[PDB]
Design an enzyme around this catalytic site. Sequence first.
Site, PDB file in Angstrom:
ATOM      1  N   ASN A  71      62.638  56.471  11.950  1.00  0.00           N
ATOM      2  CA  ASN A  71      62.815  55.086  11.524  1.00  0.00           C
ATOM      3  C   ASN A  71      61.756  54.121  12.047  1.00  0.00           C
ATOM      4  O   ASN A  71      61.130  54.363  13.079  1.00  0.00           O
ATOM      5  CB  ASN A  71      64.202  54.579  11.930  1.00  0.00           C
ATOM      6  CG  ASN A  71      65.325  55.341  11.255  1.00  0.00           C
ATOM      7  OD1 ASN A  71      65.523  56.530  11.504  1.00  0.00           O
ATOM      8  ND2 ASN A  71      66.072  54.659  10.401  1.00  0.00           N
ATOM      9  N   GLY A 119      60.629  42.951  14.172  1.00  0.00           N
ATOM     10  CA  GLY A 119      60.021  42.562  15.431  1.00  0.00           C
ATOM     11  C   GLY A 119      59.069  43.649  15.883  1.00  0.00           C
ATOM     12  O   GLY A 119      59.104  44.076  17.037  1.00  0.00           O
ATOM     13  N   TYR A 144      44.654  58.812  -3.892  1.00  0.00           N
ATOM     14  CA  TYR A 144      43.889  57.566  -3.883  1.00  0.00           C
ATOM     15  C   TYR A 144      43.185  57.195  -5.185  1.00  0.00           C
ATOM     16  O   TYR A 144      43.422  56.120  -5.730  1.00  0.00           O
ATOM     17  CB  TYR A 144      42.876  57.572  -2.733  1.00  0.00           C
ATOM     18  CG  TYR A 144      43.494  57.402  -1.364  1.00  0.00           C
ATOM     19  CD1 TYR A 144      44.491  56.453  -1.140  1.00  0.00           C
ATOM     20  CD2 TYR A 144      43.077  58.183  -0.288  1.00  0.00           C
ATOM     21  CE1 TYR A 144      45.057  56.285   0.121  1.00  0.00           C
ATOM     22  CE2 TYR A 144      43.638  58.024   0.978  1.00  0.00           C
ATOM     23  CZ  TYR A 144      44.626  57.073   1.172  1.00  0.00           C
ATOM     24  OH  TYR A 144      45.188  56.906   2.416  1.00  0.00           O
ATOM     25  N   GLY A 197      52.182  42.544   8.049  1.00  0.00           N
ATOM     26  CA  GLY A 197      52.534  41.677   6.938  1.00  0.00           C
ATOM     27  C   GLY A 197      52.471  42.429   5.620  1.00  0.00           C
ATOM     28  O   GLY A 197      53.480  42.524   4.918  1.00  0.00           O
ATOM     29  N   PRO A 198      51.296  42.967   5.245  1.00  0.00           N
ATOM     30  CA  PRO A 198      51.141  43.715   3.993  1.00  0.00           C
ATOM     31  C   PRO A 198      52.158  44.849   3.883  1.00  0.00           C
ATOM     32  O   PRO A 198      52.696  45.102   2.804  1.00  0.00           O
ATOM     33  CB  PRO A 198      49.717  44.251   4.101  1.00  0.00           C
ATOM     34  CG  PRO A 198      49.017  43.150   4.811  1.00  0.00           C
ATOM     35  CD  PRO A 198      49.992  42.801   5.912  1.00  0.00           C
ATOM     36  N   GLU A 204      55.479  43.482   2.825  1.00  0.00           N
ATOM     37  CA  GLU A 204      55.452  43.230   1.388  1.00  0.00           C
ATOM     38  C   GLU A 204      55.514  44.538   0.603  1.00  0.00           C
ATOM     39  O   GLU A 204      56.159  44.614  -0.445  1.00  0.00           O
ATOM     40  CB  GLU A 204      54.182  42.459   1.017  1.00  0.00           C
ATOM     41  CG  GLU A 204      54.035  41.123   1.734  1.00  0.00           C
ATOM     42  CD  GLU A 204      52.706  40.434   1.460  1.00  0.00           C
ATOM     43  OE1 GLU A 204      51.961  40.874   0.559  1.00  0.00           O
ATOM     44  OE2 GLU A 204      52.406  39.440   2.154  1.00  0.00           O
ATOM     45  N   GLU A 248      47.675  58.348   7.269  1.00  0.00           N
ATOM     46  CA  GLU A 248      46.340  58.294   7.854  1.00  0.00           C
ATOM     47  C   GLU A 248      46.374  57.959   9.342  1.00  0.00           C
ATOM     48  O   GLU A 248      45.612  58.525  10.127  1.00  0.00           O
ATOM     49  CB  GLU A 248      45.463  57.289   7.103  1.00  0.00           C
ATOM     50  CG  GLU A 248      45.273  57.593   5.617  1.00  0.00           C
ATOM     51  CD  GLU A 248      44.461  58.854   5.335  1.00  0.00           C
ATOM     52  OE1 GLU A 248      44.290  59.180   4.143  1.00  0.00           O
ATOM     53  OE2 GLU A 248      43.983  59.515   6.283  1.00  0.00           O
ATOM     54  N   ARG A 269      47.223  60.944  11.212  1.00  0.00           N
ATOM     55  CA  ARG A 269      46.126  61.899  11.118  1.00  0.00           C
ATOM     56  C   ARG A 269      45.006  61.583  12.106  1.00  0.00           C
ATOM     57  O   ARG A 269      44.532  62.467  12.823  1.00  0.00           O
ATOM     58  CB  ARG A 269      45.546  61.904   9.701  1.00  0.00           C
ATOM     59  CG  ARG A 269      46.407  62.561   8.640  1.00  0.00           C
ATOM     60  CD  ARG A 269      45.741  62.380   7.292  1.00  0.00           C
ATOM     61  NE  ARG A 269      46.328  63.199   6.237  1.00  0.00           N
ATOM     62  CZ  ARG A 269      45.893  63.208   4.980  1.00  0.00           C
ATOM     63  NH1 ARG A 269      44.873  62.439   4.620  1.00  0.00           N
ATOM     64  NH2 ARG A 269      46.467  63.994   4.081  1.00  0.00           N
ATOM     65  N   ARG A 323      45.734  40.770   9.178  1.00  0.00           N
ATOM     66  CA  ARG A 323      45.902  41.521   7.941  1.00  0.00           C
ATOM     67  C   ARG A 323      44.533  41.550   7.271  1.00  0.00           C
ATOM     68  O   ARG A 323      44.041  40.525   6.796  1.00  0.00           O
ATOM     69  CB  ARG A 323      46.956  40.872   7.031  1.00  0.00           C
ATOM     70  CG  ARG A 323      46.743  39.395   6.710  1.00  0.00           C
ATOM     71  CD  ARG A 323      47.862  38.858   5.827  1.00  0.00           C
ATOM     72  NE  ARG A 323      47.937  39.554   4.544  1.00  0.00           N
ATOM     73  CZ  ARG A 323      49.048  39.685   3.823  1.00  0.00           C
ATOM     74  NH1 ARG A 323      50.192  39.169   4.253  1.00  0.00           N
ATOM     75  NH2 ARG A 323      49.017  40.346   2.672  1.00  0.00           N
TER      76      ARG A 323
HETATM   77  N1  LIG Z   1      50.322  60.618  -1.686  1.00  0.00           N
HETATM   78  C1  LIG Z   1      49.226  60.580  -0.809  1.00  0.00           C
HETATM   79  N2  LIG Z   1      49.426  60.925   0.497  1.00  0.00           N
HETATM   80  C2  LIG Z   1      48.369  60.878   1.351  1.00  0.00           C
HETATM   81  C3  LIG Z   1      48.292  61.151   2.656  1.00  0.00           C
HETATM   82  C4  LIG Z   1      47.018  60.938   3.051  1.00  0.00           C
HETATM   83  N3  LIG Z   1      46.234  60.526   1.985  1.00  0.00           N
HETATM   84  C5  LIG Z   1      47.111  60.494   0.928  1.00  0.00           C
HETATM   85  C6  LIG Z   1      46.975  60.141  -0.511  1.00  0.00           C
HETATM   86  O1  LIG Z   1      45.922  59.797  -0.988  1.00  0.00           O
HETATM   87  N4  LIG Z   1      48.105  60.227  -1.254  1.00  0.00           N
END
Ligand SMILES: Nc1nc2cc[nH]c2c(=O)[nH]1
Length: 267
Positions: free
Chosen positions: A10, A15, A123, A142-143, A146, A177, A180, A197
């Site tokens: 979670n 806060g 992406y 913030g982002p 939203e 990320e 990672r 932000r």
């Molecule tokens: N769905 C998705 N998960 C991850 C996790 C790291 N990069 C990405 C991405 O581009 N898409």
Amino acid sequence: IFPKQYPIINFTTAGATVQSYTNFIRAVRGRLTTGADVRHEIPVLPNRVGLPINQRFILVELSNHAELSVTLALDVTNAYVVGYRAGNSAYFFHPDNQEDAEAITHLFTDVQNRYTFAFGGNYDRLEQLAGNLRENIELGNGPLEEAISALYYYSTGGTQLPTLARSFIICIQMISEAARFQYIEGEMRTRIRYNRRSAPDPSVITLENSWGRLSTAIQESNQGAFASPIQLQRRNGSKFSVYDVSILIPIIALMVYRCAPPPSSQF
Ligand SMILES: Nc1nc2cc[nH]c2c(=O)[nH]1
């Protein structure tokens, strides 16, 4: 009830502070990697080839400062956000293969409505939908707040694909990320620290794009020495090459399984 529910981590943007964020990230990392199997001191993610369905996904409960809840499904083998749940509707990204599609059917089996997006969750596709590139999309508490709002309201009629996609891009970077790369975690931390932000700079983007490449190189590296100089990008966009894993140790936290473990002297 479903036999053995996946582990749920979670987090709340209410806060939220540097501390709570750090705890969240560390918790996620701990749930992703079994602790064992570390190449050059860096832990590797579980191999899907022999990973059972029960230990395949991790749930992330994201709550807003206004009683809004959403749950993302993280793929333990690569910290990939496969889908999410809002209210009583589950939305999954279009799987790249039947094997993963078969695994996906096990998520949120108790929801009344299930939907699978025609588009992929990567992406390149998301940016097209959002009509904005990552370098133009701000990140921060913030982002993120939203983002949760949009995702949740998608199941009620808000929809708006561009916003929906943008929300995903935000959540992915701030969670997947961040877990990672220790570096990315820091970037987000600084943003939260000053209630800032801002859009991610080159260094961040390049790392996200090179995660797979780095993982491969580190695993196929002769005792730390890379078989070929990997180019990376600095904050100002200037490129530079990496020759040894040592430099990357304090940067990357998790790697995707690539090479089979050699004489696994796990001690
Ligand atoms: N769905 C998705 N998960 C991850 C996790 C790291 N990069 C990405 C991405 O581009 N898409």
